[PDB]
């Protein structure tokens, strides 16, 4: 605790995203938090992964493979200076806040490129310690999102569909895959159609929550202990666990629906 990192993915300083970023920093600071920032647009961050990310000789210049090359570079300390700087922030951060506007049912290209360049093997993950057993297992991450469409549009009967499915690839595949303890996402719908007074309360509510996030309960994800970790098995659910689940109405999570009903708001509300 005491050390937070806020990754913002918005170009304008007159936007609500910037407003939400400034509100978070203030609240955390008022509580004695060390707030470090990562304003991707202000830093003119480079989102494209390339051989340039490796500041040295490549093991196989003829057949360049980023995964392999980036890992070796990390091991020998030959990573681009801008990548190493972001990694240093993460290592020291206890809480990581991601502030960004929903873009094409996903994360902005500049933020996506941030994950792709900063989350290097051996540093942010390992196929020998996946998910709950990952390197960031002692950290907590929260997604603060803003949207143009209303909440009803992202409801089970909304034209766009369940928001839980949209959040799944990010909160699970990216954040939790690295070990992160994902907390409930702060969702702000149709911010472009909300009255001023209401916008003030949203910021006040955001600050209020940040006063006790560290004490919040994280979302539920199927523990890695329920799977056979090794290819001889295929990283599949343990036979014992499979049988014991046949007599259940709901699945484990959005991705592990197992063909049954998906636990409502599994990626939006905590507890099981
Ligand atoms: C390429 C692209 C793809 C998109 N894809 C999607 C999608 O898939 N799904 C979806 O739902 N939406 C999508 N959107 C819409 C996007 O999510 C919204 O435009 C964005 O979230 C609006 O928030 P904002 O941070 O830009 O703020 P703004 O546009 O500024 O709006 C915030 C409002 O609050 C006012 N304001 C600013 N600061 C403060 C403050 N401190 N206090 C009070 N009021 C304040 C602003 O003047 C404004 O009226 C997309 C947009 C783009 C460009």
Swiss-Prot record:
Per the record, the similarity remark reads: Belongs to the NAD(P)H dehydrogenase (quinone) family.
Q: Name one GO biological process term.
A: cellular response to oxidative stress
Subunit-level organization:
Homodimer. Interacts with PDLIM4 isoform 2; this interaction stabilizes PDLIM4 isoform 2 in response to oxidative stress and protects it from ubiquitin-independent degradation by the core 20S proteasome. Interacts with TP73 (via SAM domain); this interaction is NADH-dependent, stabilizes TP73 in response to oxidative stress and protects it from ubiquitin-independent degradation by the 20S proteasome. Interacts with TP53; this interaction is NADH-dependent, stabilizes TP53 in response to oxidative stress and protects it from ubiquitin-independent degradation by the 20S proteasome.
Where is substrate annotated to bind? 124-126
Q: Which organism is it from?
A: Homo sapiens (Human)
Pfam families in alphabetical order: Flavodoxin_2 (PF02525)
This protein is called: NAD(P)H dehydrogenase [quinone] 1
Which UniProt keyword terms apply here?
Answer: Cytoplasm, FAD, Flavoprotein, Isopeptide bond, NAD, NADP, Oxidoreductase, Phosphoprotein, Ubl conjugation
Protein induction: By dioxin. By oxidative stress.
Catalytic reaction(s) noted:
a quinone + NADH + H(+) = a quinol + NAD(+); a quinone + NADPH + H(+) = a quinol + NADP(+); ubiquinone-10 + NADH + H(+) = ubiquinol-10 + NAD(+); menadione + NADH + H(+) = menadiol + NAD(+)
> Result of mutating residue 127 to F/V?
Abolishes the interaction with TP73
Classify the main location: cytoplasm
Which SUPFAM superfamilies is this protein grouped with? Flavoproteins
